[PDB]
């Protein structure tokens, strides 16, 4: 039977070249005798180039291949939460089967143009620099980009951790389920990752799709789609979901590897002509639906690894061009003490304030502005043998505001805590304080109001802004704390 | 001519130009 | 003060000129690396 | 003709015909699919087989599947009933307002206006925008490079031009989003709607929207700018208007070109672009002109890769541009809007031999003054505003009056600025600036000129400003 | 089964079997040869012909020559009787001391440990090297990588770690030389012996050795790491011990593959590499790991072609490490050894929660100042130093002294430095830097800080220099 | 190919055939051009010096027997000269008695021009060095495959000596033109080009060859093969792929810069970038004694010399550092064709390293060295013969030397 | 023009040249203006990459210098015995960022008998024709 089954003509470098299979559809899952699956990516006149999902040691010339008739779909819904699954949705945390009812297809088209509405609900990270100057809204696609080891995955993690404030809450329209896709990473990193998340009690609301370093190319390829589907189940059901693709750089490599082995034509950097289309069809599935559709959302934090800061290399160019903004991390900043290494001047949020809270805006706005102003003069500092007090002023606001954007890891803040601290320097209170102390000030200052003043923060929170009152109360709280502070 | 070095040089000359224009005024 | 003014006018103008040149040198190099790296891939692929 | 599918490799489908082979560029329809799958033909591989590029996902295709030669290139509903609708690459509705019911259909692959159809002369197309019309005059049938992106009023400027084209030239406009972010199209949609350019209730829509979203395969984002072109050519070749063509953004057009090229296995050229970069562009750009029947004017959003203006994509593109409209965040910060940069924006037709000495001199007057003031700007802040001469203090005053006189209220932003939009006329524009240069309103105060139309308003505002 | 050779082109040999086609990865032995020639099956070309990679020279092979399928991937003698011995890619002793009488044999090809087998304990592994310890601490059971272009210190650094750590280590050690210098395996073997880590008379050997040097055909080079790693996995799993794995240089595994790649009929990926580089690296790097059964502390030297850290190979390896020591010819060029780049070296344990805030604040304190100085370098270069703020000419000072205090005379490089090797303890390091940063030595001369161990030697050296 | 003592003093092509039209070679032995290098077990650490005759080299980047040290630099920076001076310096021992100290040399020309080689063998003849040299020539018009083979051919002739307890020295001049030959031969066979157009195995092409230079243990004759391969960089770029490919095979490199050369620093050895992976184990104690820390001293000197190209309120320790640095730099300078004897090097470095010259004027240093060396060679050969013989600098020799330099120096600065 | 198949853009200059040659060949005097040889070069390169000829410097095929030498060798001044006629060629080449070292510009400079370099700086500064009198030659 050459219609529903085929015979392997040759097998190598994970590409199977099957004879027969006359009825297979493009991208169909097929099965080799040995039990290994494969996906038909090249339907040629005289053969099927099949992408083997595993070790090609188990396939020989002549092995019989059969069709499944089924296209790639994966488990989905609420039972995956707190689980560690492979790219096919299989459980790899050895905790037992995932009790999944619904199964969704991994590659589906993004919701069209009509079914959506402007991104308007804040997606809070807990990171002041991001939350005040590079705001993410639900349905937005914001890229975290930077060289190796700059803090990229940390941003995502702090972000995931942060959602417990709302996940332990009652308001079900503020909860955000998290999905973390690990592509090309080593298993020890993910293990370490899931640990950090368990320790913070964030696994309860997180799903981990993992396609690691030793998993065949095709699984690393798929991973992001199969994780996307999982997040779509939430989006579609009036629920909100967050997805982190770590990294899109490694998946591009996986895809390039199959493309070239199937002999498709190579373009710049050896990438296939459809590499742009691989990510665009992925990153567009993130969106903010309309009430007519459930008002549910899917926010995506895709990671791209640049090289020597070459944001214009091929893949970094595509993805930058596809997403709504970028958080640019930099080594120089990192080693200079700015952690997280966000380059505030080049980072962006097309969505902008349409996603900031009124509380934040109340402060974010002037901060954004003195910083931009400092950035103009900063370089002068170190040779400012005699600058006027006009600009000498902006250098001072400059370094303090900058110290306020600093942040340790695993400790995401509540929007109310961020504005209280930002207010402190923005209003001028730390202007006479020593740069070397702002980190210590904030820490203790925030410890104090989180202890003693939970009623003002609750106000700020509730009233959503800084009332003329709470404004006055903060003035005293900081002018007395500061006095205390320099005793 | 390395995009790295070229960038390193641009970095230090843009500052020089800035500090140098300041000193002029 | 008139000589420092003059010397710093020049220095600043030389800098900018240097800036303009390095930038143009940067783009020429950027384009050639891509082209160069791509021809290398094509050569290998065609030989098969 | 009915062909079979012989091979499917990604977005490249090979189809074999038994009797009768479709010529190159024809559109073939795949038989038996939930939705419409159009395969454009690209080559005649010989042996009765064609090599085509899919206009949408080939997921699921089957060797042997049936394919019907539509015996023609992609054709689309053209005409009035397209205005205000949103359309696909193969002229389908994607706004869910039912069928685009027109009388005529227009194949997208069309040749360009023979030499003998060419207009022999350069005429400025007026938009009513003081900066644009005074310093960087658009050209009828010409192509404009619109630089600057967000925060700077890009979408409000695109929408005022639309309106002002309907108003002053009774011409309609098309909007082709080449590689548009689905989020951003839907947001463009509702924004035109709220400002009226689009009307869902009546038949007063002044724009037809054509979309090539980023998820679409190379071939689709490749052609959608042609589809948009097709539509515009109608309001010119059938109704002889002065249409406006907006391609956002011209870089994604080129990129789509390369993807398609690579897929067809052709060796890339310098920097990885297509061997046919210059022809892919020329066959499209050239259909945008002033023929004897009318003219299409195109506002093209340009993305410059690596900030490299000599990069093959951008370099090729300037070959066709007659002017640039540089939107500037700095200018915006002055509150000045439209935030167009009066010294960076440019135009080929700013030649006395084309705009006339008067126009040419005023313009060159406005810029120099704006330049001079720029010089002084450094001094003022440092050594303080006074070694300033009876002369140096006048260039500033006027310059600062000018800077403001160059700003202006848009009728598109009335639902929002609570202010009335102004469409200043070219004549009024040159006079306005003429006099400020002249010294006729040196007594008037700065703020008298902020956000007004014709100089007359600068005078009256002064009155209300005591 | 018996196949025949049909084509020979370099290290690649195609074989035709009449009946029974040996599976991929199977090892075949060429009949009729003075020495054992193993061919690893690489692909099924079809037509009952397999394409294979030779584990040795292909000279004198003939079309038609006979080849027997061994029925299994390369399998080597694994167990305790490998300790103190020197093995081949294919498991043959190469030390002239007779057979290796192991109870068992293992195939060099195997699946990597599952996700549920991973461990997450993180214990700092002190080395005695100021720079590493201070700024990019190694971790027991972690994956360590020494990155460097030709001749910047990768091996010497591996040499001083064998001395400062391997030597006291209570557990085995496996040193796999992959595509490196033969002279070097002879230097190390004889050093192991002279120091009793290798015992030729008894069973007190605490180190097994495996070698596939630069004088070998691509094939051998594409596999020794596997052999080496396989020996190490035994002590990890079957004995459950604490292993120390040294590989110099893992880049050679990847260069090996790129060298036959074209003969395997593949379109090249970028920079000439094979399209399967990352996956080829992944299925290997994923076995070099600590599990719940045993612990591996791998120190891998990583060559950097053309000195370009973005090269697909070095670039692809960062993700497999928990700590990285990046060496730089720009630093070395100044005479600063070890030439580690203080701003490009990292460790997953550089966490206040793991090393402590004193450790952490010093490290970051040292890095800020070196960064601060890096930025000024290009500028005082031209505009000179006068205009600089006393605040800024002090960081130039301290930086230049730290830059030196980071160098150290290794005990394995006296032939190089003309200085006795010093091993500094973690607290002597933290403190020394803490004080320089504190302004406590702004009086001593920079030179006093160059090539010394502990801070006291910098003070003594000041006097000696005092005249 | 033919192998053995019969070839000495003869000029052969890449296959062994004579090209000096001086008659057939009387060869009785043959050897495969392509043999794997001896393994781990048959060798012993490099310990015997291989004296070049060049201070800069013999003091800062020492070469031992069985060692591979690369000569690399742009066109015309002097790479061949290093090799000629080395071949010429060997007469000392070859004209001597001791057979263990003798060194037979092999000079392989590749891609070079016949008139240049002819020029080369003339000079060798005029120096009475041909007697112990074999010259394998594979020049510019020879077929690619001859140029390709040439190195392996010459290597095999060197192993004859290596495997028979004798000592050989081979110069591969240069390995750049061979790679091109390999690349050509290889592409014409239709083998897919790789990085930079070369075969994916160019590393292998050179590793295989240079691994053959080696030191055999007494169990195998104690003979050795020392290789000095040459590679041409472009725009002094040593990071280049081929350059680093070869730097990662040999036991060190001698990098010559055109900047240094034009500046007067000849040899143009770049202290900082050159290395010897053998260290002092390839040095006599006399030399180790004087140049033990000099290398890192000069490295550290070049840095501060740059850091004060603006006399930035410089202390003393660095003023002293710059004062030694300059004086020592002048001593490492050297002319051509005058290879010095080890004790001669020790005498002159000694003078510098000890500070006796810290008050002489840099410009004087070269002249002083010619005067001083003259004095000790003529008058004091007892101290030279002892330093040379003991091979070390005893406490009295060190005292007789302090005495000579300081006094001669004074009379010299009259 | 911009819309004609590359082969026609490629051909165009040779045709015009033949027309100028009639005059040269008959004791007459013609002037040919090739505007630009830059774009002809890219048209020919499109042809060459599509025919699959090895791309070289700037992806240009190995024979682009000859694309130009053959063409411009035909401009010429005949002597009386051949009519005294003549053909004068003023070919145009477009540089990017005033880079006169690029492959194509250099090619063409190594063919003609002088150049007239116009500078952007000059042009804005108001000197037009923006000729660079030191760099230009005849």
Using CA atoms, how far residue D60 sits from D57, D233, F237, in Å, is 9, 36, 54
Q: Identify how many contiguous H helices and E strands chain G contains and give both numbers.
A: 5, 3
Cβ contact, residue pair E116, A56, below 8 Å: no
Question: Is residue F80 part of an annotated ligand binding site?
Answer: yes
Query: Token pair for residue D47?
Result: 């042996």
* β-strand partners of A180: A208, A244
Are F261 and F318 part of one and the same domain? no
Using CA atoms, how far residue F76 sits from E148, F70, F151, F239, F268, in Å, is 29, 16, 22, 19, 11
Cβ atoms F226, F169 nearer than 8 A = yes
Q: Which residues of D touch B (CB under 8 A)?
A: 378-379, 382-383
Are A181 and A280 part of one and the same domain? yes
Q: Which chain C residues have a beta carbon less than 8 Å from that of D271?
A: 31, 34-35
Q: Does B25 touch chain D (CB under 8 A)?
A: yes
Question: Is residue D3 part of an annotated ligand binding site?
Answer: no
Are F224 and F326 part of one and the same domain? no
Say which DSSP state F64 is in: B
Cβ atoms D197, D207 nearer than 8 A = yes
The closest alpha carbon to E306, from E282, E280, E277, E329, belongs to E329
For residue C37, give the nearest of A260, A269, A312 by CB distance. Answer: A269
Tell the CATH topology of E1-73. Thrombin, subunit H (2.40.10)
Residue with tokens 């704390």: A481
* β-strand partners of E8: E13
Q: Which chain C residues have a beta carbon less than 8 Å from that of B24?
A: 4-5, 8-9, 12
Using CA atoms, how far residue E169 sits from E125, E164, E228, E411, in Å, is 11, 9, 19, 18
Query: Token pair for residue D320?
Result: 């066709």
Question: What is the end-to-end Cα distance of chain C in Å, rounded?
Answer: 70
Searching chain A, which residue's CA lies closest to the CA of residue D56?
A109
Using CA atoms, how far residue E252 sits from E214, E220, E248, E326, in Å, is 9, 10, 8, 18
Say which DSSP state F289 is in: H
3-class secondary structure, D392: helix
Best interface-test mutation with A: which of C15, C33, C38, C44 has the largest number of A CBs within 10 A? C38
Which residues of F are known catalytic residues?
277
Using CA atoms, how far residue E394 sits from A389, E146, E391, E397, E441, in Å, is 25, 32, 6, 5, 12
Using CA atoms, how far residue E55 sits from E38, E40, E91, E284, F367, in Å, is 5, 7, 12, 18, 60
Searching chain C, which residue's CA lies closest to the CA of residue E263?
C48
| Interstrand relation of E295-303 and E143-148 (parallel, antiparallel or unpaired) | parallel
For residue D63, give the nearest of A43, A262, A267 by CB distance. Answer: A43
- Chain A / chain D CB contacts < 8 angstroms: 131
Cβ contact, residue pair A270, C30, below 8 Å: no
What CATH number is given to the structural domain containing F110?
3.40.50.300
Cβ atoms E323, E143 nearer than 8 A = yes
Rounded to whole angstroms, the Cα distance separating D302 from D255 reads 12
Rounded to whole angstroms, the Cα distance separating E244 from E296 reads 6
3-class secondary structure, E156: helix
Cβ atoms E376, E391 nearer than 8 A = no
Q: Please state the φ and ψ torsions of residue A19, each to the nearest 5 degrees.
A: -100, 130
Query: Token pair for residue F385?
Result: 């013969």
DSSP F27-61: --EE--S--PPP-STTB----SB---S-HIIIIIS
Are F256 and F351 part of one and the same domain? no
Cβ contact, residue pair E24, A57, below 8 Å: yes
How many C-beta atoms lie closer than 10 Å to residue G112's C-beta? 16
Cβ contact, residue pair D268, C31, below 8 Å: no
Rounded to whole angstroms, the Cα distance separating A314 from A276 reads 9
Q: Where are the domains of chain C?
A: 8-48
The continuous run of DSSP H or E covering D75 comes out as strand D75-78
Quick one: chain E helix, strand, coil %, rounded to 5? 40, 20, 40
Query: Token pair for residue G106?
Result: 């250099």
Rounded to whole angstroms, the Cα distance separating G112 from G15 reads 19
Q: Does B23 touch chain D (CB under 8 A)?
A: no
Cβ atoms D79, D232 nearer than 8 A = no
Are F199 and F222 part of one and the same domain? yes
Cβ atoms D336, D328 nearer than 8 A = no
Quick one: chain A helix, strand, coil %, rounded to 5? 40, 20, 35
For residue B4, give the nearest of A308, A380, A383 by CB distance. Answer: A308
Rounded to whole angstroms, the Cα distance separating F43 from E190 reads 11
Question: Is B touching G (3+ C-beta pairs, cut-off 8 A)?
Answer: no
Beta strand ranges found along D218-294 (DSSP E): 242-248
Which residues of A are known catalytic residues?
350
How many C-beta atoms lie closer than 10 Å to residue E282's C-beta? 25
DSSP A83-130: EEE-TTS-B-SSS-------EEESS-PPP-STTB----SEE--S-HHH
Rounded to whole angstroms, the Cα distance separating F340 from F353 reads 18
DSSP F328-342: HHHHT---SS-PPPH
Searching chain B, which residue's CA lies closest to the CA of residue C15?
B17
The continuous run of DSSP H or E covering A217 comes out as helix A217-236
Are A345 and A376 part of one and the same domain? no
Interface of A with C in 300-329 (CB under 8 A): 312
The closest alpha carbon to F340, from F268, F401, F388, F279, belongs to F388
Cβ atoms A183, E278 nearer than 8 A = no
Say which DSSP state G45 is in: H
Is-cis flag, bond preceding F267, omega within 30?
Answer: yes
Cβ contact, residue pair D267, G49, below 8 Å: yes
Cβ atoms F167, F215 nearer than 8 A = no
Within chain D, all domains assigned CATH 2.40.10.170 are found at: 1-73
Cβ contact, residue pair C35, D306, below 8 Å: no
The continuous run of DSSP H or E covering D371 comes out as helix D357-383
Question: Is D touching C (3+ C-beta pairs, cut-off 8 A)?
Answer: yes
| Interstrand relation of A47-52 and A136-137 (parallel, antiparallel or unpaired) | unpaired
- Chain C / chain D CB contacts < 8 angstroms: 23
What CATH number is given to the structural domain containing A55?
2.40.30.20
- Domain D350-466 CATH class label: mainly alpha
- Chain A / chain C CB contacts < 8 angstroms: 14
3-class secondary structure, E161: helix
Residue ending a domain, among A14, A42, A70, is A70
Are F394 and F324 part of one and the same domain? yes
Q: How far is F201 from chain C (nearest CA, A)?
A: 14
Using CA atoms, how far residue E22 sits from E28, E65, E71, in Å, is 8, 17, 7
Cβ atoms D175, D330 nearer than 8 A = no
Question: What is the end-to-end Cα distance of chain G in Å, rounded?
Answer: 30
| Interstrand relation of D143-147 and D104-107 (parallel, antiparallel or unpaired) | unpaired
Question: Is residue D240 part of an annotated ligand binding site?
Answer: no
Question: Is residue D293 part of an annotated ligand binding site?
Answer: no
Q: How far is D186 from chain A (nearest CA, A)?
A: 5
Using CA atoms, how far residue E361 sits from A151, A344, C32, E350, E430, in Å, is 18, 24, 44, 10, 10
Cβ contact, residue pair F190, C44, below 8 Å: no
Q: How far is E268 from chain C (nearest CA, A)?
A: 5
Rounded to whole angstroms, the Cα distance separating F156 from F27 reads 14
SS3 string, A258-283, reads HHHHCCCCECHHHCECCHHHHHHHHH
Are F121 and F20 part of one and the same domain? yes
Cβ atoms A52, A82 nearer than 8 A = no
Cβ atoms C17, D257 nearer than 8 A = no
Q: Please state the φ and ψ torsions of residue E216, each to the nearest 5 degrees.
A: -95, 160
Q: Please state the φ and ψ torsions of residue D159, each to the nearest 5 degrees.
A: -80, -30
Q: Which long-range contacts (CB under 8 A, 24 or more apart) does D16-20 make?
A: D16/D47, D16/D48, D16/D49, D16/D50, D17/D48, D17/D49, D17/D50, D17/D69, D18/D48, D20/D69
Binding residues of E: 151-156, 180-181
- Per the structure, the count of domains in chain F is 2
CA F327 to chain centre: 23
Cβ partners under 8 Å of residue A295, min gap 6:
A117, A173, A238, A288, A289
- Between CA D449 and CA D453, with CA D328 as vertex, the angle to 5 degrees is 25
Cβ contact, residue pair A266, C34, below 8 Å: no
Cβ atoms F53, F67 nearer than 8 A = no
Query: Token pair for residue E395?
Result: 């960081």
Quick one: chain F helix, strand, coil %, rounded to 5? 50, 15, 40
Rounded to whole angstroms, the Cα distance separating F33 from F12 reads 14
Cβ contact, residue pair E271, C48, below 8 Å: no
Rounded to whole angstroms, the Cα distance separating E221 from E252 reads 7
Which residues of D are known catalytic residues?
154, 180-181
Cβ contact, residue pair G55, C24, below 8 Å: no
Say which DSSP state E82 is in: G
Q: How far is B24 from chain E (nearest CA, A)?
A: 14
Cβ atoms E10, E3 nearer than 8 A = no
Are A372 and A297 part of one and the same domain? no
Cβ partners under 8 Å of residue D202, min gap 6:
none
Interface of G with C in 50-69 (CB under 8 A): 55, 58-59
For residue C35, give the nearest of D270, D306, D310 by CB distance. Answer: D270
Question: Is residue D180 part of an annotated ligand binding site?
Answer: yes
DSSP E245-290: EEEE-THHHHHHHHHHHGGGT----GGG--TTHHHHHHHHHTTSS-
Rounded to whole angstroms, the Cα distance separating E189 from E206 reads 12
Q: Which long-range contacts (CB under 8 A, 24 or more apart) does E372-378 make?
A: E372/A336, E372/E399, E373/E399, E373/E400, E373/E403, E374/E343, E375/A332, E376/A382, E378/B8, E378/B9, E378/B11, E378/B12
Question: Is residue D148 part of an annotated ligand binding site?
Answer: no
Question: What is the end-to-end Cα distance of chain F in Å, rounded?
Answer: 63
Tell the CATH topology of C8-48. Helix Hairpins (1.10.287)
The closest alpha carbon to A360, from A44, A122, A30, A70, belongs to A122
Method: X-ray
Q: How far is C47 from chain F (nearest CA, A)?
A: 5
3-class secondary structure, D448: helix
Q: Does E114 touch chain A (CB under 8 A)?
A: yes
DSSP C5-42: HHHHHHHHHHHHHHHHHHHHHHHHHHHHHHHHHHHHHH
Q: Which long-range contacts (CB under 8 A, 24 or more apart) does D96-101 make?
A: D96/A114, D97/D200, D101/D77
With both helix axes pointing from N to C terminus, report the angle between E251-261 and E277-285 in degrees, rounded to the nearest 10. Answer: 140
DSSP D112-131: ---GGGB-----BPP-S-HH
- Between CA G15 and CA G24, with CA G19 as vertex, the angle to 5 degrees is 130
Q: Which long-range contacts (CB under 8 A, 24 or more apart) does D394-398 make?
A: D394/D439, D394/D442, D395/D369, D397/D442, D398/D369, D398/D436, D398/D437, D398/D439, D398/D442
- Between CA A477 and CA A481, with CA A480 as vertex, the angle to 5 degrees is 75
Residue with tokens 């893992």: E250
CATH 1.10.1140.10 describes domain E350-467: yes
How many C-beta atoms lie closer than 10 Å to residue F123's C-beta? 14
Beta strand ranges found along D165-304 (DSSP E): 173-180, 207-213, 242-248, 295-301
Say which DSSP state D146 is in: E
Domain residues for the domain of F22 are 1-283
Q: Identify how many contiguous H helices and E strands chain A contains and give both numbers.
A: 15, 17
Q: Identify how many contiguous H helices and E strands chain B contains and give both numbers.
A: 1, 0
Rounded to whole angstroms, the Cα distance separating A392 from F224 reads 71
Q: Which of E40, E160, E180, E233 is flagged as catalytic? A: E180
Q: How far is B18 from chain D (nearest CA, A)?
A: 13
| Interstrand relation of E12-17 and E123-124 (parallel, antiparallel or unpaired) | unpaired
Rounded to whole angstroms, the Cα distance separating E216 from E184 reads 15
Q: Does G59 touch chain D (CB under 8 A)?
A: yes
Cβ atoms A135, A353 nearer than 8 A = yes
Rounded to whole angstroms, the Cα distance separating E282 from D325 reads 51
Are A211 and A182 part of one and the same domain? yes
Cβ partners under 8 Å of residue A426, min gap 6:
A363, A366, A367, A370, A401
Best interface-test mutation with F: which of E418, E442, E448 has the largest number of F CBs within 10 A? E418
The closest alpha carbon to D412, from D192, D89, D248, D105, belongs to D192
CATH code linked to domain E74-349: 3.40.50.300
Searching chain B, which residue's CA lies closest to the CA of residue D380?
B25
Best interface-test mutation with C: which of F183, F190, F192 has the largest number of C CBs within 10 A? F192
Rounded to whole angstroms, the Cα distance separating D384 from D394 reads 16
Alpha helices (H) in A137-182, listed in sequence order = 152-162, 164-167
Query: Token pair for residue D274?
Result: 């297509």
Q: Which residues of C touch G (CB under 8 A)?
A: 24, 28, 35, 39, 42
Are F200 and F296 part of one and the same domain? no
Rounded to whole angstroms, the Cα distance separating E227 from E438 reads 50
């Amino acid at each position: 039977d050459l219609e529903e089954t085929g015979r392997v003509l040759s097998i190598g470098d994970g590409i199977a070249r099957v004879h027969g299979l006359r009825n297979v559809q493009a991208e169909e899952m097929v099965e080799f005798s040995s039990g290994l699956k494969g996906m038909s990516l090249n339907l040629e006149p005289d053969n099927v180039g099949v992408v083997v999902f595993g070790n090609d040691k188990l396939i020989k010339e002549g092995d019989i291949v059969k069709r499944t008739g089924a296209i790639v779909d994966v488990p989905v819904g609420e039972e995956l939460l707190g689980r560690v699954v492979d790219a096919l949705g299989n459980a790899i945390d050895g905790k037992g089967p995932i009790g999944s009812k619904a199964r969704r297809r991994v590659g589906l088209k993004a919701p069209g143009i009509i079914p959506r509405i402007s991104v308007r609900e804040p997606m809070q990270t807990g990171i002041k620099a991001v939350d005040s100057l590079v705001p993410i809204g639900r349905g937005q696609r914001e890229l975290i980009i930077g060289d190796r080891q700059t803090g990229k995955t940390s941003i995502a993690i702090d972000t995931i951790i942060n959602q417990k404030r709302f996940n332990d809450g009652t308001d079900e329209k503020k909860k955000l389920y998290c999905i973390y896709v690990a592509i090309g990473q080593k298993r020890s990193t993910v293990a370490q990752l899931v640990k950090r998340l368990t320790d913070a009690d964030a696994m309860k609301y997180t799903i981990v799709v993992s396609a690691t370093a030793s998993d065949a190319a095709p699984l690393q390829y798929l991973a992001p789609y199969s994780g996307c589907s999982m997040g779509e189940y939430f989006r579609d059901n009036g629920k909100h979901a967050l997805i982190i693709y770590d990294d899109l750089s490694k998946q591009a490599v996986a895809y390039r590897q199959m493309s070239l082995l199937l002999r498709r034509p190579p373009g710049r950097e050896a990438y296939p002509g459809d590499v742009f289309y691989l990510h665009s069809r992925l990153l567009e599935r993130a969106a903010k639906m309309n009430d007519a559709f459930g008002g549910g959302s899917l926010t995506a934090l895709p990671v791209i690894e640049t090289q020597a800061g070459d944001v214009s290399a091929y893949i970094p160019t595509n993805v930058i061009s596809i997403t709504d903004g970028q958080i640019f991390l930099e080594t120089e900043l990192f080693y200079k003490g700015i952690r997280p290494a966000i380059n505030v001047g080049l980072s962006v949020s097309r969505v902008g304030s349409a996603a900031q809270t009124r509380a934040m805006k109340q402060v974010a706005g002037t901060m954004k502005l003195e910083l931009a102003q400092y950035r103009e003069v900063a370089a002068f500092a170190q040779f400012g043998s005699d600058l006027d007090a006009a600009t000498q002023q902006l250098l001072s606001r400059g370094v303090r505001l900058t110290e306020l954007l600093k942040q340790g890891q695993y400790s995401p803040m509540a929007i109310e805590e961020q504005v209280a601290v930002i207010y402190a320097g923005v209003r001028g209170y730390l202007d006479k304080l020593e740069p070397s102390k702002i980190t210590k000030f904030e820490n203790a200052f925030l410890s104090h109001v989180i202890s003693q003043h939970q009623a003002l923060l609750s106000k700020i929170r509730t009233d959503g802004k800084i009332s003329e009152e709470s404004d006055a109360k903060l003035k005293e709280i900081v002018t007395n704390f500061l006095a205390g502070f320099e005793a | 001519a390395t995009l790295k070095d070229i960038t390193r040089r641009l970095k230090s000359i843009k500052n020089i130009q800035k500090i140098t224009k300041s000193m002029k005024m | 003060q008139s000589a420092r003014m003059t010397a710093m006018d020049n220095a600043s103008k030389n800098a900018s000129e240097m800036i303009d040149k390095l930038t143009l040198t940067f783009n020429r190099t950027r384009q050639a690396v891509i082209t160069k790296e791509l021809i290398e891939i094509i050569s290998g692929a065609a030989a098969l | 003709t009915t062909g079979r599918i012989v091979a499917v490799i990604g977005a490249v489908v090979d189809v074999q015909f038994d009797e009768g082979l479709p010529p190159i560029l024809n559109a073939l329809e795949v038989q038996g699919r939930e939705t419409r799958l159009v395969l454009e033909v690209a080559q005649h591989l010989g042996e009765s087989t064609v090599r085509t590029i899919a206009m949408d996902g080939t997921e699921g295709l089957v060797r042997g599947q049936k394919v019907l030669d539509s015996g023609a290139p992609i054709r689309i509903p053209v005409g009035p009933e397209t205005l205000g609708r949103i359309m696909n690459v193969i002229g389908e509705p994607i706004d869910e307002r039912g069928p685009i019911k027109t009388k005529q259909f227009a194949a997208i692959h069309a040749e360009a206006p023979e030499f003998v159809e060419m207009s022999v002369e350069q005429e400025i197309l007026v938009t009513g925008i003081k900066v644009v019309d005074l310093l960087a005059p658009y050209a009828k049938g010409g192509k404009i490079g619109l630089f600057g992106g967000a925060g700077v009023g890009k979408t409000v400027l695109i929408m005022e031009l639309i309106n002002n084209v309907a108003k002053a030239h009774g011409g309609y406009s098309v909007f082709a989003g080449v590689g548009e972010r689905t989020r951003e199209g839907n947001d463009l949609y509702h924004e035109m709607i709220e400002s009226g350019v689009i009307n869902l209730k009546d038949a007063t829509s002044k724009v037809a929207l054509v979309y090539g979203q980023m998820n679409e395969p190379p071939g689709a984002r490749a052609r959608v700018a042609l589809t948009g072109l097709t539509v515009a050519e109608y309001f010119r070749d059938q109704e002889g208007q002065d249409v406006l063509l907006f391609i956002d953004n011209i870089f994604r057009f080129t990129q789509a070109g390369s993807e398609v090229s690579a897929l067809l296995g052709r060796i890339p050229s310098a920097v990885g672009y297509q061997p046919t970069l210059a022809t892919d562009m020329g066959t499209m750009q050239e259909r945008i002109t002033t023929t004897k029947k009318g003219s299409i004017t195109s506002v093209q959003a340009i993305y410059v890769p690596a900030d490299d203006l000599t990069d093959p994509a951008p370099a090729t593109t300037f070959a066709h541009l007659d002017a640039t409209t540089v939107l500037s965040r700095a200018i915006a910060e002055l509150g000045i809007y439209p935030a167009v940069d009066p010294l960076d924006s440019t135009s080929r037709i700013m030649d006395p031999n084309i705009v006339g000495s008067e126009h040419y001199d005023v313009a060159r007057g406005v810029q120099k003054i704006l330049q001079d003031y720029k010089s002084l700007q450094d001094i003022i802040a440092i050594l303080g505003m006074d070694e300033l001469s009876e002369e140096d203090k006048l260039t500033v005053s006027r310059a600062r009056k000018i800077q403001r006189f160059l700003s202006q209220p848009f009728q598109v932003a009335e639902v929002f600025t609570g202010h009335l939009g102004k469409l200043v006329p070219l004549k009024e524009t040159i006079k306005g600036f003429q006099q400020i240069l002249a010294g006729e309103y040196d007594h008037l105060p700065e703020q008298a000129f902020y956000m007004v139309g014709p100089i007359e308003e600068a005078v009256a505002k002064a009155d209300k400003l005591a």
